[PDB]
């Protein structure tokens, strides 16, 4: 289980104790930027990074500390997951998608509605095997007990 490098996550960073910035950035960019600002560990096949003062949006529409982050090559297939949601505005239908490594069509998952800054229930609308990949895939470790974060608005472990 990892996510693709173009996965979007909501990140907050703090400097000098008192200043903070928040933005939506792709996970490969987060890794590449943060890999230079802070520095890399190495294990059997992980390059593992330990930032401080960075946070990520998780279950509960709250930011918790991002404790570590890593990237690695995997032999596993990338899978594109499309998740539909809708709201009563007269129905506005929305969908989001994330590609993961390794859940059933029809299952419900939590979804972040960015425009209304609230969490909604989504439906697994499709699942697609995109095949193997040579690119790095990425992993994030979160301090809250949900062990989950929002990945292109979809809650993933």
Author numbering: -1, 1 to 15, 15A, 15B, 15C, 16 to 85, 95 to 107, 128 to 182
Task: Give me lines lifted from the publication on this model.
Here, we report the novel and atypically split PolB16 OarG intein and its biochemical and structural characterization. The PolB16 intein carries an atypical split position close to the N-terminal end of the encoded split intein domain to give IntN and IntC fragments of 15 and 168 aa, respectively. Most notably, both residues at the 1 and +1 positions are serine. This analysis suggested the PolB16 intein splices through linear and branched oxoester intermediates.
The IntC fragment contains two cysteines within motifs N3 and C2,30 (previously also referred to as motifs B and F)31 however, at non-essential and only moderately conserved positions that usually harbor hydrophobic residues. By replacement of two non-conserved cysteines, it could be mutated into a completely cysteine-less variant and further engineered for efficient splicing properties. Ser1 and Asn183 at the splice junctions were mutated to alanine to block all splicing activity. The last well-resolved amino acids, Asp108 and His109, show a conformation of the polypeptide chain that departs from the canonical intein structure.
